[PDB]
Structures are given as structure tokens and as C-alpha cells.
Amino acid sequence: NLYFQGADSCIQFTRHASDVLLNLNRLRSRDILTDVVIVVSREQFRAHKTVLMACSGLFYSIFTDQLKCNLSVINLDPEINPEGFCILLDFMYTSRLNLREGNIMAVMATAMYLQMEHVVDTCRKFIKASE
Amino acid sequence: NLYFQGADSCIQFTRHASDVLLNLNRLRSRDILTDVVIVVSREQFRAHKTVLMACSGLFYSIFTDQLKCNLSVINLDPEINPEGFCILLDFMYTSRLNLREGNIMAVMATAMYLQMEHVVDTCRKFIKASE
Ligand SMILES: Cc1cc(NCc2ccccc2F)n2ncnc2n1
Ligand SMILES: Cc1cc(NCc2ccccc2F)n2ncnc2n1
């Protein structure tokens, strides 16, 4: 079955959350209802503010700010590596984190800046395994 | 661990999709970045168009329409039961479907109208078990 008896009264659908995320990523790929452009070292990434806020403490802070919530363009710190940001943006929309020896430092520094502690801790654990 | 080696190269975060959905529901509860009001028999429900489109074929069709995508208010068919709609809206944001003997017919008819076939099939299976 696609469902089960949850701990509470309700039946719960096993694949619902992952199917929603897959569909949000399909909207992103098709540029449907994207409402922000994230600029990183002149690279541009179109996304949905709600997805960014649901994954990142920095984006949650920006988009809950009365002044900043209505910005259509957000420029990140020029020190931020676009590949590191791209890997984290894909992670937000897919649950898959493409960590490689060549990108782990950029991913970790970007996750720190974006306040994604779970990703930072994961990078730290992978780095610790190599030393 | 909060992660595993996916079938592909990437590490995957087990709870990421459900955590995103939980956070989207927290935004909904706080009325943060909600961009549409769904009106059902004069009852109003604030939501995020992207979440609605990711769950419902009717909302996908409406919000991908060049004319309708920019509507802030969507009126549903007056035949639609507000409780049935509320139960399905909560399901979209939580993966939990509060089916009860007293609401199953309204939920099924609403899921048919909203084009949520997985929910319709589930209602059909529960009804079949009672006969
Ligand atoms: C605790 C919480 C956090 C959060 N977003 C920011 C965020 C998400 C994931 C990981 C780290 C992080 F800082 N949101 N968004 C809506 N409601 C929330 N409640
Ligand atoms: C196949 C698909 C469907 C869909 N939304 C509509 C929808 C969602 C869940 C269940 C039924 C349904 F009709 N979206 N949304 C973005 N990309 C999509 N791709």
C-alpha cells in the first residue's frame, strides 16, 4: 500500500512528501511560479521563496523580513562559490546531496552561510572520516 | 544517521522531504508567503499555489494557465463541501488524511473534483471494505 495507520488517528501516505518535493522540483525545472532569482558570483538561480525558507535559516530570515520579503532578486555574498550553492539548491529540491572530495569544502562553507546546520554537520563527519 | 547512500551517487537525507513539508505547513499556519485564497461555500482557505499544484491536477491546470496563474482568489464549485476541502488541504501539507465514516463521501467527491486520483482510489478501497 501507499498508506499506513499513523501514530495519530489519520492514515498517512508514505510517498506524499517526496512526491510533493519531486513536483516542486518539476515546477522549478519548468520555471513555473518561481518568484525569486538568487545571484551568486554573477550566476543566477531561479527558485521558489517558500522552498528556500523551508530549508535555510538565512532564507527564512530574509523572506520573513517585512522589507526583504518582496525582493525578486537576492544577491549572496560574492565569496560564495556558485557550484556549492547549486549543489545545495538541488539538495533542497531533491533530498540528494552531491558531496564530492572536490566540492565538500565549498558545500560546507555555503551551508554555514545559508544556515543549514544538518548539511554542515554532515560535511564535518565526511571530512573527519578522511583525516 | 539522518542520511544514506542513494541508488545514484548522492547521499540522501531520509527526513528532508517530510521536514520541508512540515516547514511549508508552518508557513501556512503563520500566513507566511501564502499567495492564494481558496473560497469554498464562502469559507476561505489561504495557501501556497506551488503546494496546491504539486498535489492536485485541478490546481496544476489553473496555476499553469497564462490568464489564471495571477489570480489571488479562486472560487471552487459551490457543491464542494468545505470540510472535505479542509481535510484535503491538511493532507496536502501533512501527508495525513483524516478519513472518517462521516466525511469519506465528501472527501472522495472533493478529491475527484481536485483530481487527486491516489486519494480517490484510497476512499474507494475504504468504502469497498464497509460493503
Ligand atoms: C524550525 C523551522 C525552521 C524553518 N526554516 C529554516 C530552516 C529549515 C531547515 C533547516 C534549518 C533551518 F534554519 N522553518 N520554516 C518554516 N517554519 C520553520 N520552522
Ligand atoms: C505528473 C505531475 C503532476 C503534478 N501536479 C498535479 C498532481 C500532483 C499529484 C497528484 C496528482 C496530480 F494531478 N505536477 N506538478 C508539477 N509537476 C507535476 N508533475
Numbering used by the authors:
A (entry chain A), B (entry chain A): -1 to 129
Reproduce, without paraphrasing, sentences from the article in which this PDB structure was first reported.
B-cell lymphoma 6 (BCL6) protein, a member of the Broad-Complex, Tramtrack and Bric-à-brac (BTB) / Pox virus and Zinc finger (POZ) family of transcription factors, plays a key role in the formation and maintenance of B-cell germinal centres. BCL6 has an N-terminal BTB domain, responsible for obligate homodimerisation; a long unstructured central region involved in interaction with the MTA3/NuRD complex; and six C-terminal C2H2-type Zinc-fingers involved in DNA binding. Disruption of the SMRT or BCOR corepressor interaction with the BCL6 BTB domain is sufficient to inhibit DLBCL cell growth. We established a robust, soakable, high-resolution BCL6 BTB domain crystal system which allowed us to elucidate the binding mode of all nine hit series and map the binding site hot spots in relation to the binding of the corepressor peptides.
